[PDB]
Amino acid sequence: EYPTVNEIPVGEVRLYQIADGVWSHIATQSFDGAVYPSNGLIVRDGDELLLIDTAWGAKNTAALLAEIEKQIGLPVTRAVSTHFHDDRVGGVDVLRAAGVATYASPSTRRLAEAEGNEIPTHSLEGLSSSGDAVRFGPVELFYPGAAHSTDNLVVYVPSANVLYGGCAVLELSSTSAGNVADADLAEWPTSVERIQKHYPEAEVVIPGHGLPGGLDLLQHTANVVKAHKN
Ligand SMILES: [Zn+2]
Ligand SMILES: [Zn+2]
Known part of the structure; x- marks a missing residue:
């Protein structure tokens, strides 16, 4: 069913249909001597597509665009990066050069610049406080x-009751919170609670890495982060 690392080589991107006009994109990348799968989202908006997150690299992101053209046949016109790390902004330059308008919060843009990563072109205002929510094309962006x-954002597709959590949400098989160098472990469970409270009708929850599931990914994430912090 849902592709895993073993089934996607680095440089290749698969799409997985979640709902009518909602897909995830799955790519693999080598980081610090390990290969990981990574998810982002694609949402139909009329005869155009909104992309959430790059495919983690310029080559992967070019492969992503090529795969979208083959499988869906509609142009990607806008993209949003959900935080400043390279699984999320790496490839923005490819998108921009391809004519895609790239967006992120001012905080993501600042952090990306400070870290030497690619920087989305446009700022998304109205997301500076926990609980803030803004409409963007066919989705709602939420800062939990x-x-x-x-700076992490999450994305809800109201038409499909699909919640894309990015890396603020962990898959059910996870036993740890992964890379926490930029994390706020004290706040994280509260941030997840905000998501739970704001999107109780969510039917599918998609983590930044790994398998989609139901609403239980949220509580599971809070539990793992709490246990991580000890
Ligand atoms: Zn990250
Ligand atoms: Zn990540």
Whole structure:
């Protein structure tokens, strides 16, 4: 069913249909001597597509665009990066050069610049406080508070009851919170609680890495982060 690392080589991207006009994109990348799968989202908006997150690299992101053209046949016109790390902004330059308007919060843009990563072109205002929510094309963007990073955004597709958590949400098989160098472990469970409270009708929850599931990914994440912190 849902692709895993073993089934996607680095440089290749698969799409997985979640709902009508909602797909995840799955790519693999080598980081610090380990290969990991990574998810982002694609949402139909009329005869155009909104992309959430790059495919983690310029080559992967070019492969992503090529795979979208083959499988869906509609142009990607806008993209949003959900935090400042390279699984999320790496490839923005490819998108921009391809004519895609790239967006992120001012905080993500600042952090990306400070870290030497690619920087989305446009700022998304109205997301500076925990609980803030803004409409963007066919999705709602939500800032739940600091979790995996201080700037992390989550994305809800109202038409499909699909919640894309990015790296603020962990898959059910996870036993740890993973890379926590930029994380706020004290706040993270509270940030997840905000998501739970704001999107109780969510039917599918997609983590930044790994298998989609139901609403239980949220509580599981809070539990793992709490147990991580000890
Ligand atoms: Zn990250
Ligand atoms: Zn990540």
